[PDB]
Design an enzyme around this catalytic site. Structure first.
Site, short mmCIF file in Angstrom:
data_model
loop_
_atom_site.label_atom_id
_atom_site.label_comp_id
_atom_site.label_asym_id
_atom_site.label_seq_id
_atom_site.Cartn_x
_atom_site.Cartn_y
_atom_site.Cartn_z
N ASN A 143 100.69 102.94 33.82
CA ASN A 143 100.73 101.79 33.06
C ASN A 143 101.88 101.24 32.28
O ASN A 143 102.02 100.06 31.84
CB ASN A 143 99.51 101.61 32.12
N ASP B 233 105.45 102.99 24.12
CA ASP B 233 103.94 103.14 24.33
C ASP B 233 103.59 104.31 23.23
O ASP B 233 103.86 105.32 22.76
CB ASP B 233 103.70 103.66 25.64
N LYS B 234 102.26 104.01 23.14
CA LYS B 234 101.70 105.00 22.21
C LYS B 234 101.13 106.22 22.78
O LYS B 234 101.48 107.34 22.42
CB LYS B 234 100.25 104.19 21.59
MG LIG Z 1 100.67 106.47 27.61
#
Ligand SMILES: [Mg+2]
Ligand SMILES: CCCCCCCC/C=C\CCCCCCCC(=O)OC[C@H](COP(=O)(O)OCC[N+](C)(C)C)OC(=O)CCCCCCC/C=C\CCCCCCCC
Ligand SMILES: CCCCCCCC/C=C\CCCCCCCC(=O)OC[C@H](COP(=O)(O)OCC[N+](C)(C)C)OC(=O)CCCCCCC/C=C\CCCCCCCC
Ligand SMILES: CCCCCCCC/C=C\CCCCCCCC(=O)OC[C@H](COP(=O)(O)OCC[N+](C)(C)C)OC(=O)CCCCCCC/C=C\CCCCCCCC
Ligand SMILES: CCCCCCCCCCCCCCCCCC(=O)OC[C@H](COP(=O)(O)OC[C@H](N)C(=O)O)OC(=O)CCCCCCCCCCCCCCCCC
Ligand SMILES: CC(C)CCC[C@@H](C)[C@H]1CC[C@H]2[C@@H]3CC=C4C[C@@H](O)CC[C@]4(C)[C@H]3CC[C@]12C
Length: 997
Positions: A741, A359-360
């Protein structure tokens, strides 16, 4: 739970419900009280390795198959079961304790008596909940009321969907206009809401107030919702709870926690299957040589029970204790401080990771954007040259009290300070009231708020340089000069940013002078043709984008009064129309946007976490493919990928186009297949189409990429990518994230790593391993996972080799000495008891290393050997099997050949030779010597000598104290060991391992 249905939620009054709603509790633990024991037992004994011991113990209930005492079958099995159960209980208890922190957060609740404190876990559907500034939203709510006078609020949703943009939320219009928040309880109103579902960015609902004489109904959209997991940016808000607990949007995007087993454990299970199959084949051959003389099944059972230690319980015990040691070592490493181990049974997974899905937002970045570059075409200003910009502004605003570079700098800075949608918000510093700060423009109480963090960074930079945005309204804007003078600007027109136009404009009038100016900023692609002719926009924009910056082109067009009147007339005419209003308005606005004067290029950086570039380079050099799966948008994801060097500076990048059906997806897949060494950037919907129709083709193309970026990726899409990688490649995946998420893909992956988020902990609480910084991943893999994998392989193979040597020894002892007798079984058990004197030296292998931690960190190519399965494979296992058979046969046959005197003498010689041989075998296997290994070896030797002394005096044996015994044991041990020492020396000299060079 039953099928989701729409609900009618009355404001306040949680008792008005047609069903029962789940408690607002976030739960990460795998078991409850009722399912704990059955689940733990099933997950233990569903594998052949544990079930084998279970059935071995259960066979002793039948008196036909009784062999030895029951406690010898049940005490080790009970000890293993107790260790497993205690480990699982400790894990569950720690998970419950860590969940209590999130579930015990206190919020305000509106009541008839007033306001009361309520914990997050006690929130009910229909409660009116107050959420403060910078406080996490505890449940899914409808925005009803805010204390701010602008009648709106901003939400930070990066923990929910991974997006960096702030979301503007509007309260229900009827409820916002009530004089007090206590009037929410005095009206007869309800919210009709859609069924609880998984979509984060859409909501369908209705607000109805029955108290008013004309019934009031309002359509509700995502703009009126405050999902659990988002953070209120400013002000105190009131909302009505719609969903709780397992029906929260964040929770519904989260899978159930699962019990993970490592690949190494599966390989050990397969090895035990192979060993048992060999034993059964041997039993079948033995019973066939007797031509099935009758009751052959019983004889087969006795043979299997007699040689049942070929799969030793010590293998399981050593592996469990070794995993304990690895987790202890990980939790105490100060070079990666704060690391938490939750899935304590899979530290070896960290040594065999092929794909890292990262994830970014919040994982690679700090979620803090900074202004970095101002480019004027002839001079560029960086972080170290902002003093010159400040001095230019100071001179510009001193000369008036008292073209050129100063004038151009001033025009660019003023354009940056005006062309935006940022609003200064003043708060209370205790002494100063919110109205007092808004009057004197107090710097310490000023906060900049906008949906775009890039705009906030630009305005903050203009503040740092001399031109401060101190006030903004719907029609006015105020700037403070270095001389503490306020410039008032009138916002004649504003053209808000849209992701389709990729640009933003504003028309202002300077009241101090009366001149009208049109300002525009936007992406290079759209602004290249809007501005006048120039020779540096394209090249400088390319360089700045290559640096990883978010580049904006800032333009300016001075408008005469008559020109503005004509444009205003045409714009009003277009707006009052109803046919193609958007298109006619576009005709007018892009009729205005032409021949603009190019002022500057701006470069904004989304700051990376510490050592992100070296960590990614280390992962790349180790043979690990890194994919970026983010819920954020395409431009920011591409900028961060370039900034983090996820894509090489001179590496081609293919941006997947929007595809909606099978044909477009096939066309773009062919287009990308035509490229080589090109990184892939694809959005979530195009990915959905491609995986729907061309999952295999897309997967092979993406696995052939140097790097893949998936932007606007939903949590289900992230988990699906992880699953598809596992299904296609057959290799291990590691998912790294920080937000809610990322929970689904963390749980789906073979090794989930959760980064402790700034405003959320769900990824950390749901992961197998929790780290505080992304850079800790490099050590966590290259040192800890490598060492855990190698140590487990060495320890398991040595335990199996020792058991096989013992089995060969007792087979020869039974076949060559007395065929069948009670003293034969006595010697069988005595030979089996030899593992006691090698237990500590064998377990000391958990301290072994091949290289130092610094060497593993500096030479990531050592990880690729692990990626090939080198520590444990069929080759090493077969070599160990051959060695064990050779050593057992040599020891037994030398004992039976040199001195055939008696059972006692042969048993003593074989026992001593076996103990010495296994001690030398441990010594031969060790790569880096630890002083504790020396302690274990010497202590075991001393214990065996003491046993030979405590037994020599009491039982009538003098054969130990004889030169005959000494030299016979010496020759047997030499024949057993010296060939292996010679082979090790030759292998080291001729073909050394890669880590020794
Ligand atoms: Mg994140
Ligand atoms: C060199 C090799 C040559 C081979 C030539 C042929 C040899 C044929 C000999 C034996 C073949 C049959 C047994 C083979 C080994 C078991 C393989 C197997 O297919 O395993 C089935 C499963 C274990 O599968 P897994 O671990 O992969 O599951 C992982 C997947 N997951 C957990 C999600 C379910 O369940 C089981 O192990 C059940 C296994 C069968 C029952 C266990 C028998 C041994 C136990 C005790 C010995 C006797 C004591 C008395 C027993 C009776 C008492 C009344
Ligand atoms: C004995 C029966 C088995 C008990 C195993 C569970 C021990 C859990 C434990 O002992 O909890 C970890 C603490 C400190 O954990 P921490 O607060 O540093 O974690 C951030 O002690 C440790 O590390 C040592 C435990 C490390 C191994 C955990 C289980 C591995 C299988
Ligand atoms: C005495 C007779 C024989 C000894 C046999 C030794 C073989 C077993 C060793 C296990 C062990 O020695 O374990 C070591 C680890 C890490 O210590 P280190 O020796 O690498 O320290 C390095 C610093 N230097 C060099 C100064 C020591 O410590 C640990 O895992 C402690 C284990 C944690 C257990 C927690 C239980 C939770 C339930
Ligand atoms: C209560 C005892 C529970 C227990 O672990 O059983 C003890 C196990 C037994 O297996 P073994 O060593 O292969 O011995 C073979 C034996 N003769 C047999 O026929 O069964 O032997 C073991 O499994 C003990 C292994 C301990 C390894 C070191 C642990 C940390 C020490 C510090
Ligand atoms: C089967 C019997 C003979 C095994 C003998 C065990 C003892 C005597 C052996 C086995 C391993 C050996 C150690 C292995 C490693 C080192 C480190 C180096 O400084 C050389 C000496 C020293 C410290 C050795 C001393 C002797 C040693 C401790």
């Amino acid at each position: 739970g039953g099928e989701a249905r729409p609900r009618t939620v009355w404001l306040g009054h949680p008792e008005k419900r047609d069903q029962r709603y789940p408690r607002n509790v976030i739960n990460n633990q795998k078991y409850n009280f009722f399912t704990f024991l059955p689940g733990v037992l099933f997950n233990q004994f569903k594998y052949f390795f544990n079930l084998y011991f279970l059935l071995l113990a259960c066979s002793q209930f039948v008196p036909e198959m009784r062999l030895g005492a029951l406690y010898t079958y049940w005490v080790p099995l009970g000890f293993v079961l107790a260790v497993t159960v205690i480990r699982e209980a400790v894990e569950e208890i720690r998970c419950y304790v860590r969940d209590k922190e999130v579930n015990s957060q206190v919020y305000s609740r509106l009541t008839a008596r007033g306001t009361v404190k309520v914990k997050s876990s006690n929130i009910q559907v229909g409660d009116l909940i107050i959420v403060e500034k910078n406080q996490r939203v505890p449940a899914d709510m409808i925005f009803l009321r805010t204390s701010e006078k602008n009648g709106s609020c901003f939400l930070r949703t990066d923990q929910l969907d991974g997006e960096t943009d702030w979301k503007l939320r509007l309260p229900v219009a009827c409820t916002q206009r009530l004089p007090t928040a206590a009037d929410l309880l005095q009206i007869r109103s309800y919210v009709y809401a859609e069924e609880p579902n998984i979509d984060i960015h859409n909501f369908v609902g209705t607000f109805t107030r029955e108290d008013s004489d004309p019934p009031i109904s309002e359509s509700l959209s995502i703009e009126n919702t405050l999902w659990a997991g988002t953070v209120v940016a400013s002000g105190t808000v009131v909302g009505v709870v719609l969903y709780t607990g397992r029906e929260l949007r964040s929770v519904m995007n989260t899978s159930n926690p699962r019990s993970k087993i490592g690949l190494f454990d599966l390989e050990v299970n397969c090895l035990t299957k192979i060993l048992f199959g060999a034993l059964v084949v041997v039993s079948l051959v033995m019973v066939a040589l007797q031509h099935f003389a009758g009751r052959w099944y019983l004889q087969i059972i006795r043979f299997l029970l007699l040689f049942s230690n070929i799969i030793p319980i010590s293998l399981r015990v050593n592996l469990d204790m070794g995993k304990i040691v690895y987790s202890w070592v990980i939790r105490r490493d100060s070079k990666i401080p704060g690391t938490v181990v939750r899935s304590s049974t899979i530290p070896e997974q960290l040594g065999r990771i092929s794909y890292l899905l990262t994830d970014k937002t919040g994982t690679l970045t700090q979620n803090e954007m900074i202004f970095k570059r101002l480019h004027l075409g002839t001079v560029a200003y960086g972080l170290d040259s902002m003093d010159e910009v400040q001095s230019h502004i100071f001179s510009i605003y001193t000369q008036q009290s008292q073209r050129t570079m100063s004038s151009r700098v001033h025009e660019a800075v003023k354009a940056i300070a005006l062309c935006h949608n940022v609003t200064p918000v003043y708060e209370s510093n205790g002494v100063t009231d919110q109205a007092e700060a808004e009057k004197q423009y107090e710097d310490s109480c000023r906060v900049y708020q906008a949906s775009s963090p890039d705009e906030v960074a630009l305005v903050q930079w203009t503040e740092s340089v001399g031109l401060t945005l101190v006030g903004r309204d719907q029609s006015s804007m105020q700037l403070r000069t270095p001389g503490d003078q306020i410039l008032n600007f009138t916002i004649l027109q504003i053209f808000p940013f849209t992701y389709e136009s990729k640009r933003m404009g504003i028309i202002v009038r300077d009241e101090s002078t009366g001149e009208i100016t049109f300002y525009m900023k936007g992406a290079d692609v759209v602004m290249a043709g809007i501005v006048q002719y120039n020779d540096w926009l394209e090249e400088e924009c390319g360089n700045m984008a290559r640096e990883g910056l978010r580049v904006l082109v800032v333009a300016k067009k001075s408008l005469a009064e008559e020109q503005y009147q004509d444009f205003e007339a045409r714009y009003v005419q277009a707006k009052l129309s109803v046919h193609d209003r958007s298109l006619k308005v576009a005709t007018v606005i892009e009729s205005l946007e032409m021949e603009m004067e190019l002022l500057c290029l701006t470069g904004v950086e989304d700051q990376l976490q510490a050592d992100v570039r070296p960590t990614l380079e280390t992962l790349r050099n180790a043979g690990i493919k890194v994919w970026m799966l983010t819920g954020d948008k395409l431009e920011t994801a591409t900028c961060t990928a370039k900034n983090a060097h996820l894509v090489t500076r001179n590496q081609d990048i293919h941006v997947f186009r929007l595809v909606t059906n099978r044909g477009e997806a096939h066309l773009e897949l062919n287009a990308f297949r035509r490229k080589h060494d090109c990184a892939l950037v694809i959005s979530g919907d195009s990915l959905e189409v491609c995986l729907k129709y061309y999952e295999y083709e897309f997967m092979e193309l993406a696995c052939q990429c140097p790097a893949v970026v998936c932007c606007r990726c939903a949590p289900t899409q992230k988990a699906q990518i992880v699953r598809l990688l596992q299904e296609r490649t057959g290799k291990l995946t590691c998912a790294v994230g920080d937000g809610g998420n990322d929970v689904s893909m963390i749980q789906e992956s073979d090794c989930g790593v959760g980064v402790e988020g700034k405003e959320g902990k769900q990824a950390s609480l749901a992961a197998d391993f929790s780290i505080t910084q992304f850079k800790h991943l490099g050590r966590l893999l290259m040192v800890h996972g490598r060492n855990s994998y190698k140590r487990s392989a060495a320890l398991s193979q040595f335990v199996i080799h020792r058991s096989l040597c013992i089995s060969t020894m007792q087979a020869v002892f039974s076949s060559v000495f007395y065929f069948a007798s009670v003293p034969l079984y006595q010697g069988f058990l005595i030979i089996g008891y030899s593992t006691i004197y090698t237990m500590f030296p064998v377990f000391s292998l958990v301290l072994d290393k091949d290289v130092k931690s610094e060497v593993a960190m500096l030479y990531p190519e050592l990880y690729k050997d692990l990626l090939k399965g080198r520590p444990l494979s069929y080759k090493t296992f077969l070599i160990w099997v051959l060695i064990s058979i050779y050593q057992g046969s040599t020891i037994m046959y030398g004992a039976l050949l040199l001195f055939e005197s008696e059972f006692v003498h042969i048993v003593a010689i074989s026992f001593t030779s076996l103990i010495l041989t296994e001690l030398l075998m441990v010594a031969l296997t060790i790569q880096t010597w630890h002083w504790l290994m020396t302690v274990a070896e010497l202590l075991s030797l001393a214990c065996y000598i003491a046993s030979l002394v405590f037994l020599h005096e009491f039982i009538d044996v003098y054969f130990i104290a004889t030169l005959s015994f000494l030299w016979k044991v010496s020759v047997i041990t030499l024949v057993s060991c010296l060939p292996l020492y010679v082979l090790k020396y030759l292998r080291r000299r001729f073909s050394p391992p890669s880590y020794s060079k």
